[PDB]
Amino acid sequence: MREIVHIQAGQCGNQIGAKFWEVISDEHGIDPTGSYHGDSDLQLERINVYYNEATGNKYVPRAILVDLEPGTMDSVRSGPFGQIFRPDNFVFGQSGAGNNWAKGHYTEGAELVDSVLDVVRKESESCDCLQGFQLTHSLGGGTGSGMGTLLISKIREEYPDRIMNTFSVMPSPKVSDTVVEPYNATLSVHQLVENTDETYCIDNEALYDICFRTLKLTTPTYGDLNHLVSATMSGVTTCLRFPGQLNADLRKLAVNMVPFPRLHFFMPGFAPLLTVPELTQQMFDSKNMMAACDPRHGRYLTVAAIFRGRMSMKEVDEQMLNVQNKNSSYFVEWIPNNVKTAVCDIPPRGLKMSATFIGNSTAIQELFKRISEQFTAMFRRKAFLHWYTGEGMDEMEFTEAESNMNDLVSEYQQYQDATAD
Amino acid sequence: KREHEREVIQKAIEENNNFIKMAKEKLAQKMESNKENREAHLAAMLERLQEKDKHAEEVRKNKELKE
Amino acid sequence: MRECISIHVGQAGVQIGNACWELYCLEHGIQPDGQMPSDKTIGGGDDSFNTFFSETGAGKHVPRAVFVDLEPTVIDEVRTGTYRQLFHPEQLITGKEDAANNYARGHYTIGKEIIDLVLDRIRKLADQCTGLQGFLVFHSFGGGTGSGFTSLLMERLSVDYGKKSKLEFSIYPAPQVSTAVVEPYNSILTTHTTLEHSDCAFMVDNEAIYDICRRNLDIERPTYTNLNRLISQIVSSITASLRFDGALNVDLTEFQTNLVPYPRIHFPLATYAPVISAEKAYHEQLSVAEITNACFEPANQMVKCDPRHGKYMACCLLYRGDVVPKDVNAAIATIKTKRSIQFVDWCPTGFKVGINYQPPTVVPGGDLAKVQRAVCMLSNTTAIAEAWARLDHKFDLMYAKRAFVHWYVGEGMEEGEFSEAREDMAALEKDYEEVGVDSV
Numbered sequence: 001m002r003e004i005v006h007i008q009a010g011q012c013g014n015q016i017g018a019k020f021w022e023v024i025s026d027e028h029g030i031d032p033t034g035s036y037h038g039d040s041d042l043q044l045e046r047i048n049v050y051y052n053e054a055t056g057n058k059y060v061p062r063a064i065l066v067d068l069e070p071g072t073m074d075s076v077r078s079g080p081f082g083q084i085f086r087p088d089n090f091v092f093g094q095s096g097a098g099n100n101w102a103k104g105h106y107t108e109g110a111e112l113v114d115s116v117l118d119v120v121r122k123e124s125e126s127c128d129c130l131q132g133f134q135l136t137h138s139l140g141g142g143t144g145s146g147m148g149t150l151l152i153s154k155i156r157e158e159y160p161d162r163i164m165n166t167f168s169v170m171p172s173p174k175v176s177d178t179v180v181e182p183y184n185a186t187l188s189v190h191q192l193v194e195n196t197d198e199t200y201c202i203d204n205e206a207l208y209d210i211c212f213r214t215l216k217l218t219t220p221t222y223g224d225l226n227h228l229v230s231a232t233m234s235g236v237t238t239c240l241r242f243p244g245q246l247n248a249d250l251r252k253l254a255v256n257m258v259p260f261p262r263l264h265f266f267m268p269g270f271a272p273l274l275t276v277p278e279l280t281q282q283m284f285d286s287k288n289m290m291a292a293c294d295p296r297h298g299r300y301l302t303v304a305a306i307f308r309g310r311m312s313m314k315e316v317d318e319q320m321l322n323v324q325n326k327n328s329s330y331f332v333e334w335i336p337n338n339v340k341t342a343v344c345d346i347p348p349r350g351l352k353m354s355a356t357f358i359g360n361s362t363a364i365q366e367l368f369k370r371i372s373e374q375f376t377a378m379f380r381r382k383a384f385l386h387w388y389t390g391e392g393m394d395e396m397e398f399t400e401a402e403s404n405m406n407d408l409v410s411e412y413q414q415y416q417d418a419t420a421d
Numbered sequence: 422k423r424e425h426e427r428e429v430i431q432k433a434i435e436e437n438n439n440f441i442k443m444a445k446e447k448l449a450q451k452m453e454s455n456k457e458n459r460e461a462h463l464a465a466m467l468e469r470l471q472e473k474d475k476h477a478e479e480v481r482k483n484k485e486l487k488e
Numbered sequence: 489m490r491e492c493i494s495i496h497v498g499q500a501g502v503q504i505g506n507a508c509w510e511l512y513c514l515e516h517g518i519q520p521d522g523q524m525p526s527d528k529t530i531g532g533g534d535d536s537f538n539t540f541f542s543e544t545g546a547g548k549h550v551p552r553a554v555f556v557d558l559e560p561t562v563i564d565e566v567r568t569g570t571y572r573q574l575f576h577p578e579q580l581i582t583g584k585e586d587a588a589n590n591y592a593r594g595h596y597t598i599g600k601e602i603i604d605l606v607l608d609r610i611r612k613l614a615d616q617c618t619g620l621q622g623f624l625v626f627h628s629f630g631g632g633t634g635s636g637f638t639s640l641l642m643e644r645l646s647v648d649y650g651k652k653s654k655l656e657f658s659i660y661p662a663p664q665v666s667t668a669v670v671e672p673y674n675s676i677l678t679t680h681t682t683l684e685h686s687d688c689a690f691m692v693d694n695e696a697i698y699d700i701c702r703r704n705l706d707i708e709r710p711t712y713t714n715l716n717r718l719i720s721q722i723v724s725s726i727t728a729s730l731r732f733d734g735a736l737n738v739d740l741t742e743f744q745t746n747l748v749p750y751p752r753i754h755f756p757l758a759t760y761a762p763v764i765s766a767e768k769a770y771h772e773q774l775s776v777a778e779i780t781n782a783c784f785e786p787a788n789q790m791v792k793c794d795p796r797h798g799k800y801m802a803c804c805l806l807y808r809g810d811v812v813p814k815d816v817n818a819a820i821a822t823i824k825t826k827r828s829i830q831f832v833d834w835c836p837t838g839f840k841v842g843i844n845y846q847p848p849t850v851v852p853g854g855d856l857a858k859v860q861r862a863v864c865m866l867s868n869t870t871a872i873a874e875a876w877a878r879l880d881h882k883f884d885l886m887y888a889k890r891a892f893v894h895w896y897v898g899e900g901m902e903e904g905e906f907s908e909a910r911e912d913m914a915a916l917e918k919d920y921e922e923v924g925v926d927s928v
């Protein structure tokens with residue numbers, strides 16, 4: 001009864017969104033045709049969270065595909081699990097963004113945003129009790145960054161009491177398309193802090209290093225990076241899709257993980273990439289983080305983790321309390337019992353047992369310091385500003401975006417150096 | 422002593438009724454206060470979003486003056 | 489006559505109620521369909537079990553209770569549970585959206601939509617009673633519905649029923665089984681609001697119960713089923729004086745007369761005995777003198793605290809099963825000379841004893857062993873203030889940085905409500921110190 005409307009925008013947003021639906025369809029026993037052929041009744045107890053039950057016992061994914069060019073969305077249709085999506089939810093443009101945040105948020109995206117909302121309202125009136133909206137997109141692009149943050153602001157106008165969740169993809173020089181990426185990122189972050197309740201920081205620099213160093217891939221394609229994103233998203237929504245001792249929803253997650261409305265950016269983690277203590281120690285390791293931030297360089301505010309697969313309930317409870325006592329310096333004292341953990345009996349496809357991690361560490365400021373450094377490195381020389389100013393923007397808006405992001409870092413620094421007495 | 426027995430039982434009723442009276446007022450206060458406050462937060466939040474719309478209208482207008 | 493309408497709010501109260509009413513049906517002999525062969529009087533009666541169970545024309549004995557939750561996923565299990573026929577559809581009330589562990593959403597936002605509906609269902613149960621005695625509210629301290637909606641409910645009940653007795657069975661939060669963070673926030677807020685609207689409140693520390701089931705029942709990771717079935721035994725022994733009769737049976741309100749010296753001091757320290765597995769109970773009879781000594785042991789208390797570090801203001805013993813006064817009077821005399829029992833100088837030191845001859849009953853498949861006798865101690869000690877101490881400490885840690893407060897403010901509450909709730913809690917701990925200090 002707790003439905004969640006999914007939206008994907010941009011070239012990156014649609015591909016990482018497509019992979020998300022492919023994985024969870026396997027974990028719920030859903031074929032590309034849209035039928036059910038599972039074996040457990042635990043797959044259909046919370047199936048109406050992401051799927052709509054239509055005529056012929058079909059489970060159509062509550063997803064809205066948005067882009068400014070047919071190039072990416074055409075691949076989703078012809079690819080696997082492409083005939084399962086609702087044909088009317090495909091909202092695409094023709095002009096494109098050209099990796100420009102200005103065009104996506106003010107020019108091009110504003111001409112198509114109203115057509116997207118019509119699909120959103122249709123998928124919200126069929127909800128018994130709408131949780132909120134999860135958005136998958138990139139911040140280093142144009143459509144996903146510009147129109148992505150644009151859709152959010154427009155959604156909160158009609159749904160102000162609903163929770164806004166996002167899977168933002170942080171750009172990186174290692175996997176860079178253009179040079180104006182730090183601009184699009186900063187202008188996106190400036191919007192995310194104001195209109196989101198919780199945002200997953202999927203950093204490409206972190207994804208690249210994992211595939212390169214650990215997974216041993218000399219030439220990491222986009223497919224290898226998304227495989228880590230798919231498993232990450234599959235984990236963080238396990239308790240949302242599978243029943244258990246814990247009644248989970250988006251708001252309750254936001255209530256417990258966000259002590260301060262501005263500091264709502266998390267740090268995903270997955271393991272492996274085997275016993276319980278080994279799986280536990282590898283989950284809090286800096287190499288298994290989906291964000292290029294060493295957790296020992298900062299302190300945790302709120303921590304949540306999932307343990308999938310058949311394992312000892314007693315052993316899990318011991319290992320979690322063991323990683324806290326041996327590392328009590330990396331956790332704030334003014335937030336008692338700031339580490340929660342639940343166990344799912346159903347493991348991911350192709351794994352005996354896994355572990356997904358979510359952390360609201362103050363060490364996430366390193367991610368913002370990196371982007372801000374790249375931002376101010378080009379903005380001080382007024383480089384590539386004719387792309388944005390030509391769309392009707394000014395240097396004042398860039399200053400606000402920079403200033404707001406710099407304040408956010410100071411906020412993470414404040415509660416990090418904060419003590420109890 | 423007869424008029425004393427009347428005073429005691431009447432005072433008990435007066436205190437009991439006052440307990441119900443004050444409780445109803447304290448409750449209606451919080452319920453009205455919480456209502457106005459929540460509406461204010463929503464009114465403020467929507468206003469900030471409507472300012473983004475006005476700002477968005479000026480950006481598309483500023484580009485129009487360059488064509 | 490003298491009926492008691494129970495109320496179960498939130499996932500805690502409902503699931504606990506599932507264990508309590510299942511235990512009631514076992515002790516009285518009521519089938520899951522509602523039929524009770526021992527009851528010859530059809531339509532009703534003035535028997536002792538008519539306090540918690542009303543009767544119909546079909547012979548179906550219906551519990552005088554109302555289950556309410558802001559989300560249906562909990563009560564829906566009761567609608568399709570084993571005892572689904574036992575309740576009437578108008579007694580199981582559900583919403584569509586929970587409070588999401590938020591006091592403001594439970595007390596104001598979501599609660600306001602259903603609160604008028606709940607009272608109307610409560611009123612219908614009240615109009616069926618010949619003479620209402622009071623209410624029984626089962627809830628958790630930290631749950632958004634168990635703390636928010638409960639406080640909203642207790643205020644309304646005080647208006648619609650005046651100063652009629654309302655007893656609480658709150659669930660004190662515990663880190664080992666803590667559902668979600670901000671537990672102390674919801675706990676302080678519901679304790680502050682219900683304080684002047686509750687005549688007596690029995691606290692149950694989840695950690696205290698958790699430790700018993702690991703020690704006395706040898707369970708590695710006890711589930712909610714293991715805890716609730718244990719709690720139900722305590723609740724059963726307390727209400728045993730209301731559901732049964734006897735020559736040595738003493739009414740609960742007579743115990744309550746001693747347990748409450750001051751309006752603000754209505755938090756007794758419950759202690760049950762004996763808790764023992766079937767393997768350990770085989771070929772080992774536990775006498776009256778042995779289960780009494782277990783009552784004065786900190787490891788068997790429902791709330792973790794140290795009575796030796798505090799003073800007693802009242803002490804009651806509710807025995808059940810094959811128990812005679814001869815053994816009790818001999819037992820107490822022994823304990824009084826081997827324990828750290830220190831009363832305050834403004835109240836008697838004598839113990840009040842109640843005995844119910846109906847033997848205890850265990851849930852089939854339960855971990856508890858079918859014993860011949862049991863005892864529940866309700867002692868009003870100043871050492872229960874230690875419970876508020878650990879809770880207020882954790883509260884002050886988060887409010888010192890205003891963490892998680894914006895979720896409450898954003899729903900309508902003010903910081904003034906927080907500051908007012910804490911200053912009241914600080915006043916409560918002070919009152920527990922004032923009652924402990926010797927006279928002049």
Ligand SMILES: Nc1nc2c(ncn2[C@@H]2O[C@H](COP(=O)(O)OP(=O)(O)OP(=O)(O)O)[C@@H](O)[C@H]2O)c(=O)[nH]1
Pocket residue numbers: 497498499500501503504557558559586587588589590594628629630631632633634635659660661662665666667668671694712713715716
């Ligand atoms: N002992 C015991 N405690 C429980 C049980 N179920 C829930 N609780 C307690 O309840 C607290 C959370 O509230 P819940 O009862 O789970 O749900 P709720 O009160 O309706 O709160 P919301 O989520 O806001 O709706 C937890 O801290 C638990 O300690 C139970 O079965 N046994």
Ligand SMILES: Nc1nc2c(ncn2[C@@H]2O[C@H](COP(=O)(O)OP(=O)(O)O)[C@@H](O)[C@H]2O)c(=O)[nH]1
Pocket residue numbers: 009010011012013015016097098099138139140141142143144145169170171172175176177181204222225226229
């Ligand atoms: N993980 C992942 N990242 C991507 C993918 N495609 C693009 N990106 C990232 O997104 C940025 C470019 O965004 P882009 O896709 O062009 O946005 P759009 O033009 O609005 O659709 C680059 O910095 C890439 O690192 C993808 O398929 N997977």
Ligand SMILES: CCOc1ccc(C2=Nn3c(nnc3-c3ccccc3OC)SC2)cc1
Pocket residue numbers: 236239240246247248249250252253256257301302303304305306337338339340341342356357358667668669
């Ligand atoms: C630190 C404060 O304590 C907490 C209290 C409650 C939660 C809830 N978990 N939750 C929800 N939805 N997804 C999750 C989740 C996400 C990632 C990992 C583990 C999860 O939990 C199974 S609902 C509430 C989390 C932390």
Ligand SMILES: [Ca+2]
Pocket residue numbers: 527528529530531532533543
């Ligand atoms: Ca009868």
Ligand SMILES: [Mg+2]
Pocket residue numbers: 011099141177
């Ligand atoms: Mg591109």
Ligand SMILES: [Mg+2]
Pocket residue numbers: 247498499586631
């Ligand atoms: Mg609940």
